[PDB]
Amino acid sequence: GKKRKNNLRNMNEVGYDDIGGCRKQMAQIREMVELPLRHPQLFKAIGIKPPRGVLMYGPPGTGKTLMARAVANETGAFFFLINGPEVMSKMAGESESNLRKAFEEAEKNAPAIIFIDEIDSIAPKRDKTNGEVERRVVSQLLTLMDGMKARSNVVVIAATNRPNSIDPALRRFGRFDREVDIGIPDATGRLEVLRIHTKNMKLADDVDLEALAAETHGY
């Protein structure tokens, strides 16, 4: 069926059918995440080291988390989620422990995917990292990512609002080197989104979703 599959076919029930209007970026993230994990033999045969980090960004509400969760569920790999706020709400000295745990658990269950949602809230711009705790957490994250090179079949995905909001040290070789940009959709994309969302509403007979898609620009 679908997703390793009424039996064969609430954030673990999202697939590629719940996303519309982002074919290009979806293809990029898929070819960057699935192939290293689903088919690691290609890279062994061709003798290359696939990049690990992936950094998505775009305006809020563009479905970054939706895409990450959909890719994780479709790949069928051990998925570990890290939220910037909830990591940064822990008592002093516990955020680093949470990061170390997350990464150790991900490593021990390879293949795995680590999704750091809203990474700009735990590794913000170096100017905004005013405080001992901010520096300690940023350093812990950098150490964990640097020490992951030995780890294999583990991919880290980070989502941020803008490229200039995270610490510049996270955008180097051996770190979030690949980048993806999500933009507002076009008329076809908006029509697809409308069809996705209004697939359960009791729409009246006189609905012109095409007209709505035409009228709704910048949404």
Partner: protein, 194 residues
């Protein structure tokens, strides 16, 4: 109480200087939980402020937690270490005793100090001599207290008795005591008593 292996080990403790200053103003009471001590209220005589007990967490950070209902008493203790003198015979003890004449008010058991026990314990040595034997029978803390309570010997006689029983130089004092009139009356009545 007994150690982890099932023995009769002994432990020594001492309460801190703030627990000592906390109980004086009441402010503490025992709780149904053995390890935790309760806290009293702000009555019209005793005024109890908010009590915080400070602890350090596993991350090396001190954390203050309000404990009005009850707090552990481990913050009100300091632990000492006990021991016994090395087997090397230093003999700095004040008494070669603690095995003999019955102790203090143990009337519940058969240990009842009385003239018969003296007649059976401290009379054969006083009827023979062997001043060393008499000295090692006379150096019992509880025996000294008992004979003092008997009040047969006058204060000076008892002072020379204690200094004969506790001082490393006792020959002359022991001879003076055994020759003293008070001791002679004591031993005579003890012999006559049955």
């Amino acid at each position: 109480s007994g150690n982890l292996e099932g023995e009769i080990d002994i432990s020594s403790y001492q309460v801190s200087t703030e627990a000592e200053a906390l109980v004086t103003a009441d402010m503490i009471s025992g709780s149904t939980f053995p390890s935790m001590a309760y806290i009293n209220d702000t009555t019209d005589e005793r005024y109890v402020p908010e009590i915080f007990y400070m602890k350090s967490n596993e991350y090396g950070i001190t954390v203050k937690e309000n404990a009005k209902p009850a707090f552990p008493v481990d913050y009100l203790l300091v632990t000492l270490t006990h021991g016994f003198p090395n087997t090397d015979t230093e003999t700095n003890s004040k008494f070669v005793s603690s095995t003999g004449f019955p102790w203090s008010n143990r009337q519940a058991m058969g240990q009842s100090q009385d003239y018969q026990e003296l007649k059976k314990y401290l009379f054969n040595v006083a009827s023979s001599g062997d001043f060393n034997l008499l000295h090692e029978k006379i150096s019992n803390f509880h025996l000294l207290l008992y004979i003092n309570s008997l009040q047969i010997l006058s204060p000076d006689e008892w002072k020379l008795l204690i200094e004969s029983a506790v001082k490393n130089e006792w020959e002359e004092s022991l001879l003076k005591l055994v020759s003293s009139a008070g001791w002679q009356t004591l031993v005579m009545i003890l012999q006559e008593s049955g």
